[PDB]
Coordinates of C-alpha atoms in Angstrom, one line a residue:
Chain A
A132 CA -104.8 8.1 -17.8
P133 CA -100.8 8.4 -16.9
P134 CA -99.8 11.4 -15.5
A135 CA -99.8 15.0 -17.6
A136 CA -96.5 15.2 -19.7
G137 CA -93.7 17.5 -18.0
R138 CA -95.6 16.2 -14.4
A139 CA -93.0 14.4 -12.2
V140 CA -93.2 10.7 -10.9
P141 CA -95.5 11.0 -8.4
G142 CA -94.3 10.8 -5.2
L143 CA -91.0 11.4 -5.5
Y144 CA -88.5 14.0 -3.8
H145 CA -87.0 16.0 -5.8
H146 CA -86.3 20.5 -5.2
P147 CA -87.9 22.9 -8.5
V148 CA -85.1 24.4 -10.6
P149 CA -85.7 27.6 -13.0
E150 CA -85.3 27.7 -16.2
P151 CA -82.3 27.1 -17.5
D152 CA -80.8 30.5 -19.0
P153 CA -81.7 30.4 -23.0
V154 CA -79.2 32.7 -23.9
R155 CA -76.5 30.0 -23.0
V156 CA -78.6 27.0 -24.0
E157 CA -78.2 28.3 -27.3
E158 CA -74.6 28.9 -26.8
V159 CA -73.9 25.5 -25.4
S160 CA -75.8 24.3 -28.5
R161 CA -74.3 25.4 -30.9
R162 CA -70.5 25.3 -29.7
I163 CA -71.2 21.3 -29.2
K164 CA -72.6 21.3 -31.8
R165 CA -69.8 22.5 -34.1
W166 CA -67.5 20.5 -31.5
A167 CA -69.3 17.6 -33.0
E168 CA -69.2 17.9 -36.5
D169 CA -66.1 19.9 -37.7
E170 CA -63.5 19.0 -34.7
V171 CA -64.4 15.0 -33.8
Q172 CA -67.1 14.3 -36.5
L173 CA -68.8 12.4 -34.3
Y174 CA -71.8 11.6 -36.7
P175 CA -71.4 10.6 -40.7
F182 CA -78.1 15.8 -33.7
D183 CA -79.5 17.1 -30.5
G184 CA -77.6 20.4 -29.3
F185 CA -80.8 22.1 -27.4
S186 CA -81.5 19.2 -24.8
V187 CA -77.7 18.8 -24.1
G188 CA -77.7 23.3 -23.7
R189 CA -80.3 22.7 -20.9
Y190 CA -79.1 19.8 -19.5
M191 CA -75.8 21.2 -18.8
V192 CA -76.9 24.7 -17.9
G193 CA -80.1 23.5 -15.9
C194 CA -76.7 21.1 -14.1
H195 CA -74.7 23.1 -13.4
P196 CA -76.0 27.5 -12.6
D197 CA -72.9 28.7 -11.1
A198 CA -70.9 27.9 -14.7
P199 CA -68.9 30.8 -14.5
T200 CA -68.2 30.7 -18.4
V201 CA -69.9 28.7 -21.2
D202 CA -66.3 27.6 -21.8
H203 CA -66.5 26.1 -17.9
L204 CA -69.9 24.7 -18.9
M205 CA -68.3 22.9 -22.9
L206 CA -65.7 21.2 -20.6
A207 CA -68.6 19.1 -18.8
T208 CA -70.5 19.1 -22.0
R209 CA -68.1 17.3 -24.5
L210 CA -67.2 14.6 -21.7
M211 CA -71.0 14.0 -21.6
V212 CA -71.2 14.0 -25.3
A213 CA -68.4 11.7 -25.1
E214 CA -70.0 9.1 -22.6
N215 CA -72.7 9.0 -24.8
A216 CA -71.0 8.3 -27.6
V217 CA -69.6 5.4 -25.9
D218 CA -72.7 3.9 -24.2
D219 CA -74.9 4.3 -27.9
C220 CA -72.1 2.9 -30.1
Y221 CA -70.6 0.4 -27.8
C222 CA -73.6 -0.8 -24.9
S228 CA -73.6 -8.2 -28.3
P229 CA -72.1 -7.4 -24.8
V230 CA -70.0 -10.1 -25.7
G231 CA -66.4 -8.6 -26.4
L232 CA -67.1 -5.4 -24.4
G233 CA -64.0 -5.4 -21.5
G234 CA -62.2 -5.0 -24.7
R235 CA -64.0 -2.2 -26.3
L236 CA -64.4 0.3 -23.1
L237 CA -60.5 -0.3 -21.9
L238 CA -59.1 1.0 -25.3
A239 CA -61.6 3.8 -24.7
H240 CA -60.5 3.8 -21.3
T241 CA -57.0 4.6 -22.6
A242 CA -58.0 7.5 -24.3
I243 CA -58.3 9.5 -21.0
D244 CA -55.5 6.9 -18.8
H245 CA -53.4 7.5 -21.7
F246 CA -51.5 4.6 -22.5
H247 CA -47.5 4.6 -21.8
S248 CA -44.7 2.3 -23.9
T249 CA -42.2 2.0 -26.0
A250 CA -41.3 4.3 -29.3
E251 CA -42.8 2.0 -31.6
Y252 CA -46.4 1.2 -29.8
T253 CA -46.9 4.5 -28.8
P254 CA -47.9 5.9 -32.1
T255 CA -50.3 3.1 -33.1
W256 CA -52.0 3.4 -30.0
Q257 CA -52.0 7.2 -31.0
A258 CA -53.5 7.2 -34.3
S259 CA -56.0 4.2 -32.6
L260 CA -57.7 7.0 -30.6
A261 CA -59.1 8.7 -33.9
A262 CA -60.3 5.8 -34.8
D263 CA -64.2 6.0 -34.2
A264 CA -66.6 8.3 -32.9
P265 CA -65.9 7.6 -29.4
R266 CA -62.2 8.0 -29.3
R267 CA -62.1 11.3 -31.1
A268 CA -64.8 11.7 -28.3
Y269 CA -63.1 11.4 -25.4
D270 CA -59.5 11.8 -26.4
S271 CA -60.5 15.7 -27.3
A272 CA -62.9 16.1 -24.3
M273 CA -60.5 15.2 -21.9
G274 CA -57.7 17.5 -23.5
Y275 CA -59.6 19.8 -23.1
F276 CA -61.0 19.1 -19.6
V277 CA -56.5 18.3 -18.9
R278 CA -56.2 21.8 -19.5
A279 CA -58.6 23.6 -17.3
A280 CA -58.5 20.9 -14.6
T281 CA -56.1 20.8 -12.0
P282 CA -54.4 17.6 -12.2
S283 CA -56.0 16.2 -9.0
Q284 CA -59.8 17.0 -10.8
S285 CA -58.5 15.0 -13.9
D286 CA -56.8 12.3 -11.6
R287 CA -60.0 11.8 -9.8
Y288 CA -62.7 11.7 -13.4
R289 CA -60.4 8.8 -14.5
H290 CA -61.3 7.0 -11.7
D291 CA -65.1 7.6 -12.0
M292 CA -64.4 6.8 -15.4
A293 CA -62.8 3.8 -14.4
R294 CA -65.7 2.8 -12.3
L295 CA -68.7 3.9 -14.4
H296 CA -66.6 1.1 -16.9
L297 CA -66.4 -1.5 -14.5
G298 CA -70.2 -0.6 -13.8
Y299 CA -70.8 -1.4 -17.4
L300 CA -69.3 -4.5 -17.7
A301 CA -71.4 -6.0 -14.7
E302 CA -74.3 -5.3 -16.7
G303 CA -72.9 -6.5 -20.0
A304 CA -72.0 -9.7 -17.9
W305 CA -75.4 -10.4 -16.9
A306 CA -77.0 -9.8 -19.7
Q307 CA -74.6 -12.1 -22.6
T308 CA -77.1 -14.4 -20.0
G309 CA -80.0 -13.4 -19.0
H310 CA -79.1 -13.2 -15.7
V311 CA -81.4 -11.1 -13.3
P312 CA -79.6 -10.0 -10.1
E313 CA -80.4 -9.9 -6.4
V314 CA -82.1 -6.4 -6.0
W315 CA -78.7 -4.8 -3.8
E316 CA -76.5 -6.2 -6.5
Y317 CA -78.4 -4.9 -9.1
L318 CA -78.1 -1.2 -7.0
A319 CA -74.1 -2.1 -6.4
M320 CA -73.8 -2.2 -10.3
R321 CA -75.6 0.8 -10.2
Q322 CA -73.6 2.3 -7.7
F323 CA -70.9 2.4 -9.9
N324 CA -72.9 2.4 -14.1
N325 CA -74.2 5.2 -12.5
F326 CA -73.6 9.4 -13.6
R327 CA -71.3 10.2 -11.1
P328 CA -68.5 11.1 -13.0
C329 CA -71.2 13.9 -14.1
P330 CA -71.9 16.4 -10.6
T331 CA -68.2 15.7 -9.5
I332 CA -67.1 17.8 -12.2
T333 CA -69.0 20.5 -10.8
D334 CA -66.1 22.2 -8.9
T335 CA -64.4 22.1 -12.2
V336 CA -67.2 23.7 -13.6
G337 CA -67.5 26.2 -11.4
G338 CA -64.0 27.2 -11.2
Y339 CA -63.0 26.5 -7.7
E340 CA -61.5 23.1 -6.6
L341 CA -62.5 20.4 -4.3
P342 CA -58.9 20.1 -2.8
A343 CA -58.0 16.2 -3.1
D344 CA -57.8 15.4 0.3
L345 CA -61.0 16.7 1.6
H346 CA -62.3 14.6 -1.6
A347 CA -60.6 11.6 -0.1
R348 CA -62.7 11.8 3.3
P349 CA -65.0 9.0 4.0
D350 CA -67.9 11.1 4.8
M351 CA -67.6 12.9 1.4
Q352 CA -67.0 9.4 -1.1
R353 CA -70.5 8.7 1.1
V354 CA -72.1 11.8 0.4
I355 CA -71.1 11.2 -3.1
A356 CA -72.1 8.0 -4.0
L357 CA -76.0 8.8 -1.9
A358 CA -76.1 11.5 -4.4
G359 CA -75.2 9.9 -7.6
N360 CA -77.2 6.4 -6.8
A361 CA -80.1 8.9 -6.0
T362 CA -79.9 10.7 -9.3
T363 CA -79.1 7.3 -11.1
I364 CA -82.6 5.6 -9.6
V365 CA -84.1 8.9 -11.3
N366 CA -83.0 7.9 -14.8
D367 CA -84.6 4.2 -14.3
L368 CA -88.1 5.7 -12.8
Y369 CA -88.5 7.9 -16.3
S370 CA -87.2 5.3 -18.8
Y371 CA -89.0 2.4 -17.7
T372 CA -91.7 2.7 -20.0
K373 CA -89.3 3.4 -22.6
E374 CA -87.2 0.0 -21.7
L375 CA -90.6 -2.5 -22.0
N376 CA -90.5 -1.9 -25.5
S377 CA -86.4 -2.0 -25.8
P378 CA -84.7 -4.9 -27.7
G379 CA -85.1 -7.3 -24.9
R380 CA -85.1 -6.8 -21.0
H381 CA -83.0 -4.1 -19.5
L382 CA -82.6 -4.3 -16.2
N383 CA -83.5 -1.0 -13.8
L384 CA -84.4 -1.1 -10.0
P385 CA -88.4 -1.6 -10.8
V386 CA -87.7 -4.7 -13.0
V387 CA -84.9 -5.9 -11.0
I388 CA -87.7 -5.9 -8.0
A389 CA -91.0 -7.3 -9.4
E390 CA -88.4 -10.4 -10.7
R391 CA -85.8 -11.2 -8.0
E392 CA -88.9 -9.9 -4.9
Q393 CA -92.1 -11.2 -7.0
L394 CA -94.5 -8.6 -7.1
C395 CA -96.8 -6.8 -9.2
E396 CA -95.2 -4.0 -12.1
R397 CA -96.6 -1.3 -10.1
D398 CA -95.7 -2.1 -6.4
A399 CA -92.0 -2.8 -7.4
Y400 CA -92.6 0.9 -9.5
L401 CA -93.4 2.4 -6.4
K402 CA -91.0 0.8 -4.3
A403 CA -88.3 1.7 -6.2
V404 CA -89.8 5.8 -5.9
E405 CA -89.8 4.9 -2.0
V406 CA -86.0 2.9 -2.6
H407 CA -85.0 6.8 -4.4
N408 CA -86.7 8.8 -1.7
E409 CA -84.8 7.3 1.2
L410 CA -81.3 7.5 -1.3
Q411 CA -82.1 11.4 -1.7
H412 CA -83.0 11.8 2.0
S413 CA -80.1 10.0 3.3
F414 CA -77.7 12.2 0.3
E415 CA -79.2 15.4 1.7
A416 CA -78.5 14.3 5.5
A417 CA -75.2 13.1 4.7
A418 CA -73.9 16.4 2.9
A419 CA -75.9 18.5 5.8
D420 CA -73.7 16.6 8.3
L421 CA -70.4 17.5 6.5
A422 CA -71.2 21.1 5.6
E423 CA -71.7 22.1 9.7
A424 CA -68.2 19.2 10.2
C425 CA -65.9 21.0 7.8
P426 CA -67.4 23.9 6.5
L427 CA -64.8 24.8 4.3
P428 CA -65.5 27.4 1.7
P429 CA -64.7 25.0 -1.1
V430 CA -66.3 21.8 0.5
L431 CA -69.7 24.2 1.1
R432 CA -69.5 25.3 -2.5
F433 CA -69.1 21.6 -3.6
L434 CA -72.0 20.2 -1.5
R435 CA -73.9 22.7 -3.0
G436 CA -72.7 22.2 -6.7
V437 CA -73.5 18.5 -6.3
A438 CA -77.4 18.8 -5.1
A439 CA -77.6 21.2 -7.7
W440 CA -76.4 18.8 -10.7
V441 CA -79.1 15.9 -8.6
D442 CA -81.7 19.1 -8.7
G443 CA -80.6 19.5 -12.2
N444 CA -80.8 16.1 -14.0
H445 CA -84.4 15.7 -12.1
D446 CA -85.6 18.2 -13.9
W447 CA -84.3 17.4 -17.6
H448 CA -85.6 13.8 -17.0
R449 CA -88.9 15.4 -16.1
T450 CA -89.3 17.8 -19.1
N451 CA -88.4 15.1 -21.3
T452 CA -91.4 13.4 -20.0
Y453 CA -93.1 15.1 -23.4
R454 CA -91.0 12.6 -25.1
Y455 CA -91.9 10.0 -23.1
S456 CA -94.4 8.5 -20.9
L457 CA -94.6 7.4 -17.4
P458 CA -96.5 4.5 -17.2
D459 CA -99.9 4.2 -15.4
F460 CA -99.8 3.8 -12.1
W461 CA -101.5 6.6 -10.1
Chain B
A132 CA -29.5 -26.5 -22.1
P133 CA -32.5 -23.9 -21.1
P134 CA -30.5 -21.2 -18.4
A135 CA -29.3 -22.4 -15.0
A136 CA -32.1 -22.5 -12.3
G137 CA -31.9 -19.4 -10.2
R138 CA -30.3 -17.7 -13.2
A139 CA -32.7 -14.4 -14.6
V140 CA -33.4 -13.7 -18.0
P141 CA -30.6 -13.3 -20.5
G142 CA -30.6 -9.9 -21.7
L143 CA -33.1 -9.0 -19.4
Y144 CA -31.7 -4.8 -17.9
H145 CA -32.4 -5.7 -14.5
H146 CA -30.9 -4.6 -10.7
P147 CA -29.2 -7.0 -8.2
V148 CA -30.9 -7.3 -5.0
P149 CA -29.9 -8.5 -1.4
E150 CA -31.1 -11.2 0.1
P151 CA -34.4 -10.7 1.7
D152 CA -34.0 -10.1 6.2
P153 CA -34.9 -14.0 7.1
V154 CA -36.1 -13.1 10.6
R155 CA -39.0 -10.9 9.0
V156 CA -39.8 -13.6 6.1
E157 CA -40.6 -16.3 8.4
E158 CA -42.3 -13.8 10.8
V159 CA -44.5 -12.0 7.6
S160 CA -44.9 -16.1 6.7
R161 CA -46.5 -16.5 10.1
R162 CA -49.1 -13.8 10.7
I163 CA -50.4 -14.0 6.9
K164 CA -50.8 -18.0 7.7
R165 CA -52.9 -17.2 10.8
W166 CA -54.8 -14.6 8.8
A167 CA -55.5 -16.8 6.0
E168 CA -56.5 -19.5 8.2
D169 CA -57.9 -17.8 11.2
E170 CA -59.3 -14.5 9.8
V171 CA -60.8 -15.2 6.7
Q172 CA -60.9 -18.7 6.0
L173 CA -59.2 -18.2 3.1
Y174 CA -58.9 -22.7 1.8
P175 CA -61.0 -25.0 3.6
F182 CA -50.0 -22.5 2.5
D183 CA -47.0 -21.0 1.2
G184 CA -46.4 -18.1 3.3
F185 CA -42.8 -18.3 3.0
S186 CA -43.0 -17.2 -0.8
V187 CA -45.0 -14.2 0.2
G188 CA -43.2 -13.0 2.9
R189 CA -39.8 -13.1 0.5
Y190 CA -41.8 -11.2 -2.3
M191 CA -43.4 -8.9 0.0
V192 CA -39.7 -8.5 2.4
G193 CA -38.0 -7.8 -1.6
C194 CA -40.1 -5.6 -2.5
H195 CA -40.4 -3.1 0.9
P196 CA -37.2 -3.2 1.9
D197 CA -37.9 0.1 3.9
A198 CA -40.8 -1.2 6.2
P199 CA -40.4 0.4 9.0
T200 CA -42.2 -3.2 10.8
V201 CA -44.0 -6.2 10.1
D202 CA -47.6 -5.0 11.0
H203 CA -46.3 -2.1 7.6
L204 CA -45.4 -5.9 5.4
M205 CA -48.5 -6.8 6.8
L206 CA -50.7 -4.4 5.0
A207 CA -49.2 -5.0 1.5
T208 CA -49.5 -8.9 2.3
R209 CA -53.0 -9.3 3.3
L210 CA -54.3 -7.1 0.0
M211 CA -51.4 -9.3 -2.1
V212 CA -52.6 -12.5 -1.2
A213 CA -56.7 -11.5 -1.6
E214 CA -55.8 -10.5 -4.8
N215 CA -54.8 -13.7 -5.8
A216 CA -56.8 -15.1 -3.8
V217 CA -59.5 -13.0 -6.8
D218 CA -57.1 -14.2 -9.7
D219 CA -57.0 -17.9 -8.7
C220 CA -60.7 -18.3 -7.6
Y221 CA -62.6 -15.8 -10.8
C222 CA -60.3 -15.8 -13.2
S228 CA -65.9 -19.5 -18.0
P229 CA -64.7 -15.5 -17.9
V230 CA -68.6 -15.1 -19.1
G231 CA -70.2 -13.7 -16.1
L232 CA -66.9 -12.4 -14.6
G233 CA -67.7 -8.4 -15.0
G234 CA -70.6 -9.0 -12.4
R235 CA -68.4 -11.3 -10.2
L236 CA -65.6 -8.5 -10.3
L237 CA -67.7 -6.0 -9.4
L238 CA -69.6 -7.3 -6.4
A239 CA -66.1 -8.0 -5.3
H240 CA -64.9 -4.4 -5.9
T241 CA -67.2 -3.0 -3.7
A242 CA -65.3 -4.8 -0.5
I243 CA -62.2 -2.5 -1.8
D244 CA -64.9 0.8 -2.8
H245 CA -67.7 0.2 -0.6
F246 CA -72.0 0.0 -1.2
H247 CA -73.7 2.8 0.2
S248 CA -77.7 2.3 0.4
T249 CA -80.5 2.3 2.2
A250 CA -80.8 0.8 5.7
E251 CA -83.1 -1.9 4.0
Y252 CA -80.2 -3.0 1.4
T253 CA -76.7 -2.3 3.2
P254 CA -76.8 -5.7 5.4
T255 CA -77.7 -7.7 2.4
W256 CA -74.8 -6.7 0.5
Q257 CA -72.7 -6.4 4.3
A258 CA -73.9 -10.3 4.7
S259 CA -71.8 -10.7 1.3
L260 CA -68.7 -9.5 2.4
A261 CA -68.7 -12.9 4.1
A262 CA -69.6 -15.1 1.5
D263 CA -66.1 -16.0 -0.5
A264 CA -62.5 -16.3 0.2
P265 CA -61.5 -13.4 -2.2
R266 CA -64.5 -10.8 -0.7
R267 CA -63.3 -11.8 2.4
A268 CA -59.5 -11.4 2.1
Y269 CA -60.3 -8.4 0.6
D270 CA -62.9 -6.8 2.9
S271 CA -60.1 -7.8 6.0
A272 CA -57.2 -6.2 3.9
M273 CA -58.6 -3.6 2.7
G274 CA -59.7 -2.9 6.7
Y275 CA -56.1 -2.7 7.8
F276 CA -55.4 -0.9 5.1
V277 CA -58.0 1.8 5.4
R278 CA -56.9 1.8 9.6
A279 CA -53.5 2.4 8.5
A280 CA -53.4 4.9 5.5
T281 CA -54.1 8.4 4.7
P282 CA -57.8 9.4 2.9
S283 CA -55.7 10.0 0.4
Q284 CA -53.7 6.6 0.3
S285 CA -56.6 4.8 0.5
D286 CA -58.7 6.2 -2.3
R287 CA -55.4 5.7 -4.4
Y288 CA -55.8 2.0 -4.1
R289 CA -59.1 2.0 -4.6
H290 CA -59.1 3.8 -8.3
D291 CA -55.4 1.5 -9.0
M292 CA -57.7 -1.5 -8.1
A293 CA -61.0 -0.6 -10.9
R294 CA -57.8 0.0 -13.3
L295 CA -56.6 -3.4 -12.7
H296 CA -60.2 -5.3 -12.8
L297 CA -60.8 -3.5 -16.2
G298 CA -57.6 -4.4 -17.2
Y299 CA -58.6 -8.7 -16.3
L300 CA -62.0 -7.9 -17.9
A301 CA -60.2 -6.8 -21.2
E302 CA -58.8 -10.0 -21.0
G303 CA -61.6 -12.5 -20.3
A304 CA -63.7 -10.6 -23.0
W305 CA -60.6 -11.5 -25.5
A306 CA -60.7 -14.8 -24.0
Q307 CA -64.5 -15.6 -24.6
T308 CA -64.0 -14.8 -28.2
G309 CA -60.3 -16.3 -28.5
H310 CA -59.4 -12.8 -29.5
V311 CA -55.6 -11.8 -30.5
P312 CA -55.1 -8.4 -30.4
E313 CA -52.7 -6.5 -32.0
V314 CA -49.4 -6.1 -29.9
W315 CA -50.1 -2.6 -28.9
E316 CA -53.7 -3.5 -27.9
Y317 CA -52.3 -6.3 -25.6
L318 CA -49.7 -4.1 -23.8
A319 CA -52.6 -1.3 -23.5
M320 CA -54.5 -4.4 -21.3
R321 CA -51.2 -5.0 -19.2
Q322 CA -51.1 -1.8 -18.2
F323 CA -53.9 -2.0 -16.2
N324 CA -54.4 -6.1 -15.3
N325 CA -51.0 -5.3 -14.1
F326 CA -49.0 -5.2 -10.8
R327 CA -49.8 -1.6 -10.3
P328 CA -51.7 -1.5 -7.3
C329 CA -48.6 -3.2 -5.2
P330 CA -45.7 -0.7 -6.6
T331 CA -47.7 2.4 -5.3
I332 CA -48.6 1.8 -1.8
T333 CA -44.8 1.7 -1.0
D334 CA -45.3 5.3 1.1
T335 CA -48.2 3.5 3.0
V336 CA -45.5 0.4 3.5
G337 CA -42.6 3.0 4.3
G338 CA -44.7 4.9 6.4
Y339 CA -44.8 8.0 5.0
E340 CA -47.5 9.9 2.8
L341 CA -46.5 11.2 -1.4
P342 CA -49.1 14.5 -1.3
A343 CA -52.3 13.7 -3.6
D344 CA -51.4 17.0 -5.5
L345 CA -47.6 15.4 -6.5
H346 CA -49.3 11.7 -7.2
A347 CA -51.5 13.2 -9.1
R348 CA -48.8 14.6 -11.7
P349 CA -48.4 14.0 -15.1
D350 CA -45.2 13.0 -14.5
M351 CA -45.6 11.5 -11.9
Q352 CA -48.6 9.2 -13.9
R353 CA -46.1 8.7 -16.4
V354 CA -43.4 7.2 -14.0
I355 CA -45.9 4.9 -12.2
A356 CA -47.4 3.5 -15.6
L357 CA -43.8 2.5 -17.0
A358 CA -42.9 0.6 -14.4
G359 CA -46.0 -1.1 -13.7
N360 CA -45.6 -1.6 -17.8
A361 CA -41.7 -3.2 -17.3
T362 CA -42.2 -4.8 -14.2
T363 CA -45.1 -6.7 -15.4
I364 CA -43.9 -8.1 -18.8
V365 CA -41.1 -9.3 -16.6
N366 CA -44.2 -11.6 -15.1
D367 CA -44.8 -12.3 -19.2
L368 CA -41.0 -13.3 -19.5
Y369 CA -41.4 -15.4 -16.7
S370 CA -44.0 -17.4 -16.7
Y371 CA -44.3 -18.1 -20.1
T372 CA -43.3 -21.8 -20.5
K373 CA -46.0 -22.6 -17.9
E374 CA -48.3 -20.9 -20.1
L375 CA -47.0 -23.1 -22.8
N376 CA -49.2 -26.1 -21.1
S377 CA -51.6 -23.7 -19.2
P378 CA -55.9 -24.9 -20.1
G379 CA -56.0 -23.3 -23.4
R380 CA -54.1 -20.3 -25.2
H381 CA -52.9 -17.6 -21.9
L382 CA -51.5 -14.4 -24.0
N383 CA -48.4 -13.1 -22.4
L384 CA -45.7 -10.3 -24.5
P385 CA -44.1 -12.9 -26.5
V386 CA -46.9 -15.0 -27.7
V387 CA -49.4 -12.4 -29.0
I388 CA -45.6 -10.4 -30.4
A389 CA -45.9 -13.8 -32.6
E390 CA -49.1 -14.7 -33.5
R391 CA -49.5 -11.2 -34.8
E392 CA -45.9 -10.2 -36.2
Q393 CA -46.0 -13.7 -37.5
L394 CA -42.0 -14.5 -35.8
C395 CA -41.0 -17.3 -34.4
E396 CA -41.6 -18.2 -30.9
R397 CA -37.7 -18.1 -30.0
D398 CA -37.7 -14.2 -31.9
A399 CA -40.8 -13.2 -30.6
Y400 CA -39.8 -13.8 -26.8
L401 CA -36.4 -11.8 -27.9
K402 CA -38.3 -9.1 -28.7
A403 CA -39.8 -8.9 -25.6
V404 CA -37.0 -8.8 -23.9
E405 CA -36.2 -5.6 -25.6
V406 CA -39.5 -4.4 -25.1
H407 CA -39.2 -4.9 -21.3
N408 CA -35.8 -3.4 -21.5
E409 CA -36.9 0.1 -22.9
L410 CA -40.0 0.2 -21.0
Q411 CA -37.2 -0.2 -17.6
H412 CA -34.9 2.2 -19.0
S413 CA -37.7 4.9 -19.7
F414 CA -39.7 4.0 -16.2
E415 CA -35.5 5.0 -15.1
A416 CA -35.2 8.0 -16.6
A417 CA -38.3 9.3 -15.9
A418 CA -38.1 9.2 -12.8
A419 CA -34.3 11.0 -12.6
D420 CA -36.0 13.5 -14.4
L421 CA -38.6 14.3 -12.1
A422 CA -36.4 13.7 -8.8
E423 CA -34.6 16.8 -10.0
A424 CA -38.0 18.4 -10.8
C425 CA -39.0 17.6 -7.9
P426 CA -36.4 16.8 -5.0
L427 CA -39.5 17.3 -2.3
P428 CA -38.1 14.8 0.0
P429 CA -41.6 12.3 -0.1
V430 CA -41.0 12.5 -3.7
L431 CA -37.7 11.0 -3.6
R432 CA -38.7 8.3 -1.5
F433 CA -42.1 7.1 -3.5
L434 CA -39.7 7.1 -6.3
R435 CA -37.1 5.2 -4.7
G436 CA -39.5 3.0 -3.7
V437 CA -41.0 2.1 -6.6
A438 CA -37.9 1.1 -8.0
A439 CA -36.9 -1.4 -4.9
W440 CA -40.6 -2.6 -5.2
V441 CA -39.9 -3.4 -9.4
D442 CA -36.7 -4.9 -8.6
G443 CA -37.6 -6.9 -5.8
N444 CA -40.1 -8.0 -8.0
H445 CA -37.7 -9.2 -10.7
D446 CA -35.7 -10.7 -7.5
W447 CA -38.9 -12.7 -6.5
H448 CA -40.0 -13.7 -10.1
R449 CA -36.1 -14.8 -11.1
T450 CA -35.6 -16.9 -7.3
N451 CA -38.6 -19.1 -8.5
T452 CA -36.8 -20.3 -11.8
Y453 CA -36.4 -22.9 -9.3
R454 CA -39.8 -24.0 -9.9
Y455 CA -40.9 -22.5 -13.3
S456 CA -38.0 -22.9 -15.9
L457 CA -37.0 -20.6 -18.6
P458 CA -37.4 -21.6 -22.6
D459 CA -34.6 -22.7 -24.1
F460 CA -33.8 -19.8 -27.0
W461 CA -30.0 -19.0 -25.7

């Protein structure tokens, strides 16, 4: 008797969210399907699930056009992760796909050959188009910030792929450091661009704000480890997640390693909340306050989407 | 009869520079030796060569303390590149070393284990200490900017390491895209921090300024391919550089592939100069003008250090 479909992980600290606006969900679903099919030929598609995800994560988006900025980038990240993630060879594939986000600058001879490569597969078409919309809408600081969060993500994938090539199981803290980079982070950190305002770059760069962002990404990324745990038991080979690493390294039974992972998640989510409360008091400028709230909304919305997806993918029977 | 020791690559576009201030060289040499030996135990050391390098590249540094910011980071990058760069496994080593530059944020349990890892080897001690000095001196925007340039560098190393694991020879444009990231870039882009002023983040993020920075890094990085070419013929196995890739892909004789590489360098260095002249006219704010000049100085100084090092490492006999 594993928990009831639609129920949250027992013991996981989280915040309920409202039903996502069904009119916006349907509209995002139609436009993303058409972008996928007609603009970037993403396949030779679940628009509805990505719609719910993005509307739930960005309740402050002024329009569906703002929602679409985040939606195309999220679908494009999924095209890379499913189409590129043998990990041998990964570092070359990802660097070329990264040039769709952070452009190559070269001679009159070599530039057009790179430009042609941007049409060459689903992942680079997805990125090049999705980034194109984002760069027209956001400020240059917002675009640079996203490119850095994507470089972090790609470094994260490549640590994970390197350990996979040797079946290495890292220490728990090492897994968690990899998962700080291989992480949802580039999705909530665009909450200002999606919300139609700007967190100024000098405030984004403060060390306290960097710690807030990191804790939130780390917590909401361990949510994915906990909800997708059962599905990864069947995975082609051994895929790492926080419960599996704790069990292997701290030699614990699965159930206890899982329950400890829930407790790790909770402490990260509580520290994210305390850090954001402290910075809201230290620096109560409106864009700071809005950005903190929009990261918390993205985090709560990401939890709800995982939860509402337990209708597809069960929780383990540990309670 | 290969060119005379101390002479530049024939046909390479470059700018002469003054002798580096010998008093500053000697002082940087003593302080870096002592940092290497007493603060970070970098080995169980050529202070003079790194001194000349940094003084020649940063003629505007107000003090030796400012020079030292760049010097410790450069020596720390060299400790990673020589101590970590089998490429299997690289993506895990580099991500953990990256956490010395972009800190891990985690639970009260796992944080101190990571903190201990920062003492564990020369490369992470070098980074953690060097970044520590830089973060105290620079603005938070300057520190974030350096972390992004280091994430680029690490992505670049990992593309190169992935192609090395299969002996892949990329197309020329693909090599040049990898070398845009695996690149000197994080050294000239700290020229403002070293110069004791700040290029504001919103101006750094402009697309035209990003193209200027990229072209300069690309040109001055191909300078390293051209000067170190002969030494890489003897390398343990086949190391890629622009002449070797052009020869292999464009099936050319070595000499002609080399001469074409010189011409690629020239066009990149000319376009960097035109792009910087255009932005100096479009946006003649003093920190912009100073930053453009300081990137050009770093580029000229990097060329001179390579040239003055032909006393150690010969040019090929192609002229």
